[PDB]
Amino acid sequence: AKLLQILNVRVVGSGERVVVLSHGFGTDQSAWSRVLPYLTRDHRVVLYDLVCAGSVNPDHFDFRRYDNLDAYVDDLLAILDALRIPRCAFVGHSVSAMIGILASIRRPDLFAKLVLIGASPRFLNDSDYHGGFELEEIQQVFDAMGANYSAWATGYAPLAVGADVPAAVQEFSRTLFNMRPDISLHVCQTVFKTDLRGVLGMVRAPCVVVQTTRDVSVPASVAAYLKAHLGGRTTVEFLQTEGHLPHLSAPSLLAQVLRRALARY
Numbered sequence: 267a268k269l270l271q272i273l274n275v276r277v278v279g280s281g282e283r284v285v286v287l288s289h290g291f292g293t294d295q296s297a298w299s300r301v302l303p304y305l306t307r308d309h310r311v312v313l314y315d316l317v318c319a320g321s322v323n324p325d326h327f328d329f330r331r332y333d334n335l336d337a338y339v340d341d342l343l344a345i346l347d348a349l350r351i352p353r354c355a356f357v358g359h360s361v362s363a364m365i366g367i368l369a370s371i372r373r374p375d376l377f378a379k380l381v382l383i384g385a386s387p388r389f390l391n392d393s394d395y396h397g398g399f400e401l402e403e404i405q406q407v408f409d410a411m412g413a414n415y416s417a418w419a420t421g422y423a424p425l426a427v428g429a430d431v432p433a434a435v436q437e438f439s440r441t442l443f444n445m446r447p448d449i450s451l452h453v454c455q456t457v458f459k460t461d462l463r464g465v466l467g468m469v470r471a472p473c474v475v476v477q478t479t480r481d482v483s484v485p486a487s488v489a490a491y492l493k494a495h496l497g498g499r500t501t502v503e504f505l506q507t508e509g510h511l512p513h514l515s516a517p518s519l520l521a522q523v524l525r526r527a528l529a530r531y
């Protein structure tokens with residue numbers, strides 16, 4: 267209820283097929299603006315900002331509550347409950363792909379389908395597991411985020427976008443710079459702490475894992491790992507371009523994959 271307002275919840279479009287757009291680290295719901303008109307004809311679209319988004323009042327951020335991704339799942343569920351939507355497809359980027367996986371396990375009745383973009387179950391390497399990151403690597407990043415947040419944000423943006431698409435760099439920079447630096451580091455620590463490998467078989471929803479040709483946070487082998495471990499019917503749909511933010515850098519191509527993934531659920 268207060269959440270509806272606090273997280274800037276908007277419902278646009280129309281249809282018996284409800285879809286939730288749940289954005290990732292460093293953006294807010296506006297990151298979906300380019301793909302949104304491809305879904306508005308056929309679906310009722312629910313959009314919201316994560317409590318850590320720069321567009322949400324940062325004094326809402328309770329540092330103890332959001333120690334864990336469960337608390338973000340709480341909000342998502344409270345949002346859906348407030349709207350009396352008893353079933354939906356969910357599209358999650360980055361940290362929201364993790365949020366959607368947890369939410370779909372807590373409420374399988376609610377999530378008829380997942381679509382996972384820039385998704386990983388764990389970023390740290392492990393004996394037989396290639397996450398893409400070692401402990402020293404992340405720690406260097408946490409240390410830069412505190413030392414000089416704006417320099418870190420300026421160096422991270424182009425790498426997240428991956429392809430040379432200056433409009434996407436600038437737009438990802440604007441939301442990145444809009445995050446309160448202490449919140450931003452907090453979320454980044456939470457995410458890099460998270461390990462969903464064990465609960466992947468608990469997801470019952472069909473799922474589409476969207477793979478780009480390169481992702482600074484998601485090595486090539488992670489998608490085939492998700493496909494082999496998610497417990498519902500899972501496919502990996504491929505974009506012919508690179509980057510961690512395709513909804514900013516290749517929105518037309520992403521819109522193709524979204525229309526197809528959201529056809530039947």
Ligand SMILES: CC1=C[C@H](O)OC1=O
Pocket residue numbers: 407422454482483
């Ligand atoms: C992928 C990644 C490296 C960056 O500096 O922070 C991150 O989340």
